[PDB]
Design an enzyme around this catalytic site. Sequence first.
Site, PDB file in Angstrom:
ATOM      1  N   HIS A   1       0.815  -1.214   0.000  1.00 61.22           N
ATOM      2  CA  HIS A   1       0.000   0.000   0.000  1.00 61.22           C
ATOM      3  C   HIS A   1       0.850   1.266   0.000  1.00 61.22           C
ATOM      4  O   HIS A   1       0.345   2.350   0.284  1.00 61.22           O
ATOM      5  CB  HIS A   1      -0.986   0.027   1.187  1.00 61.22           C
TER       6      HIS A   1
ATOM      7  N   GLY B   1       3.651   6.766   9.931  1.00 64.44           N
ATOM      8  CA  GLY B   1       4.852   6.435   9.159  1.00 64.44           C
ATOM      9  C   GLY B   1       5.684   5.285   9.695  1.00 64.44           C
ATOM     10  O   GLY B   1       6.864   5.183   9.374  1.00 64.44           O
TER      11      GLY B   1
ATOM     12  N   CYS C   1       4.770   2.095   9.228  1.00 66.43           N
ATOM     13  CA  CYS C   1       4.454   0.931   8.423  1.00 66.43           C
ATOM     14  C   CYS C   1       5.756   0.422   7.835  1.00 66.43           C
ATOM     15  O   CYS C   1       6.611   1.206   7.406  1.00 66.43           O
ATOM     16  CB  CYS C   1       3.481   1.289   7.295  1.00 66.43           C
TER      17      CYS C   1
END
EC number: 3.4.19.12
Lengths: 5, 5, 5, 301, 302
Positions: free
Chosen positions: D39, D141, D143
Site C-alpha cells: 500500500h 509512518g 508501516c
Amino acid sequence: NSTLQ
Amino acid sequence: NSTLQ
Amino acid sequence: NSTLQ
Amino acid sequence: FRKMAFPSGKVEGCMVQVTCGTTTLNGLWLDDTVYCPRHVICTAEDMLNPNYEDLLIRKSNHSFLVQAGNVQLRVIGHSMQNCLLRLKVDTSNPKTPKYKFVRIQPGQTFSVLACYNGSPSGVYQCAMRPNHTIKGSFLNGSCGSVGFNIDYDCVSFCYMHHMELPTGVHAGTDLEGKFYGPFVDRQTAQAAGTDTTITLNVLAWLYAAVINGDRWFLNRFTTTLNDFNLVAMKYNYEPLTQDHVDILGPLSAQTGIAVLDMCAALKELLQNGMNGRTILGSTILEDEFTPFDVVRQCSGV
Amino acid sequence: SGFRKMAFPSGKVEGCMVQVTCGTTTLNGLWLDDTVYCPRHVICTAEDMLNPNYEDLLIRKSNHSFLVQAGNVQLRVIGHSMQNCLLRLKVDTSNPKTPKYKFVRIQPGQTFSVLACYNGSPSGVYQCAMRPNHTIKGSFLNGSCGSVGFNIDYDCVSFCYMHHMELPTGVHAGTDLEGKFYGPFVDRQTAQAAGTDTTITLNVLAWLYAAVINGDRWFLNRFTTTLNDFNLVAMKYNYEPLTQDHVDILGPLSAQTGIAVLDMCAALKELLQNGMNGRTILGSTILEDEFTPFDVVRQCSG
C-alpha cells in the site's frame, strides 16, 4: 482502520 | 551481602 | 632498557 | 522480571525509507532487495478498495525513491508478493545479517523495531495475540516496521506492520506478504475478534516464578486437562492442549513440577485471586512470556 | 496507538561492548574511541571484595595485567587509570564504530535504556527508571556488571549508567560514566540497604495524560486542587512530593490535552483514594510511573 501508519 | 560482577 | 608495562 | 527485547543492531542496519509519490514508509533491505508494504503505492482514496495489481502497472522503478541514510538506492526492478512489494536495487546491503523468514504462531512473541520514515525510533517486546493482532505502539509512518527473534547469529523475521485497527490494535504480515488473521490491506469494516489469555505463557511465567524462588501459589493436588479447561475457559483462558503441555516439558523437567500440577495451581490462582500477594512482582498473571523466553532470560543466553 | 514501554535502539551501543578480564574476574566494558571503561572491581579477587583498597590493589597491576577482547580478537592495553569507581584502560586499536556521545549524570525519576551483556556479548535491551532511592529495579543483571544505561537524542548517545552491584534487597546499584555512584553505595561486598523509595508522581501524571491523549477519560472528575492539598494526600500513599517545577514540566501535555495540571492532580488524588475498581488505564491495573513527561510526548507524537 488506518493504513499508512 | 551486596554482590558484584 | 624497556619496562614491560 | 522485565520483558526484554532482543538487541536491535542487526535489524537497524536493514531499515530504509521508501517513498512513492506523496507516500513514505519504512523498508527492509536484505541483500539486493527491499521489502515494504504494497500500500505504499497509494494515497488514501485508493485504499477504500484499491486494485493494487492495476495500480502497480502504472508504476516504474523511478516511481520509487528508496533511501538509506542520506544515500539514495537506485531501484532496478519491482514486483508484488501477496501484500508485499519486492524492490530490487542495484546495491547489496553490506550490513545484511544472517536471516530467515518464518511465520510466527498465535501466542508466540518477538521484538519489534518501530521505525519512522527510515529511522529506528525504539524497540519493544510483544506477543502475537490469539485474535491475530498485536498490542504495540505505532504512530504515523511506522508501516514497514518489523518483528523478529534472534538465535545466535540468525535473525528470524516474522512480522511487518501494515494496518491499525479501530480497536487501537495492529495488523500485519509475515515477510511473504500474507496477513496474520482475516484482515486485509484495504479500508473496510473489519475489527479484531475477541481475545483470550495465552494460557501457555501464563504457565511458563509461573515456572519462571518457581525458578526464581516465588512458589507460594503451588499446592498438593493436581488436575485433569479437561477439568482445567473447564475452569480456565470461564476466566477467558485459551484452552490448553496436549501439544502445549509437551512444550512445557523442559521447564517442567527443570522444576520437577508436572504441567498438570501447575495447572492445578493456576486453577486455584484463578478461583481465589492472589489475596494481595504478588508473583515476580506483578499483581496480575503475565501472559506474554513464552516457554522459550523463560529459558532465554533465566538460563542467561 | 497502543502504549508500549519502549527502549532505545541498541545498535550504537552494541558496537562498543567488550569483555575485560583480570586474573579470574570477567565483566563487560565500554570501548569508545581508544578507551575502555569498566567497574574497577574487575581487579578484585573474590576475597578482596570484602574490604578492598583499590588504590593499593591497582598499584600491583600492569597494562598486560588486563585482557580486553572485542569478540574473539584481543585488544592491547597500553595504559590504565582509575577514576572514582571506574577504570579507564587505554588501548592500541580504536573502535571505528564509536558513535557520537556524551557522559551524563541523570536525576532520580528519569528513564533510560539498559543493554544487558554477558562476557562483552549483548543479550537484551529494556527501558527502566532511575528510582527515587537511586537504585534501578532491573531484576536482569545477573553477572552483567559493566553493562550500561543510555539515552539516544537523534544520533548522539548519552551514557548515564554502568552496572556495578546486586544490592541484596533485589534491585541494583550503579555508577555514572565518570565513576561516581548513584545513591549511598560503595564497591564492596558489605550489607547495604536501598533507602526508602517513593512513587514517581511526575511520571504517573504524564502517564495519565498519555491515556487521555490515547482516548481514555473515565478517571477524570469535576474537581481541582491546589498543589498543597494534593501533596497532603499523595504523601500519605508514598508519592514523591510534587513541586511547581514538576507542574511547569507537565506544561505541554496539559496544553495538548486541554486538561490543567492541577485538575489532573485532582484525578490522581481520587484514584489514590478510591482505587481503580477493577478498571484499567492504558492496559494497566496499577498506576505506571516509569514513563517521563518526555517519554510520553516522544511516543504519543513521534
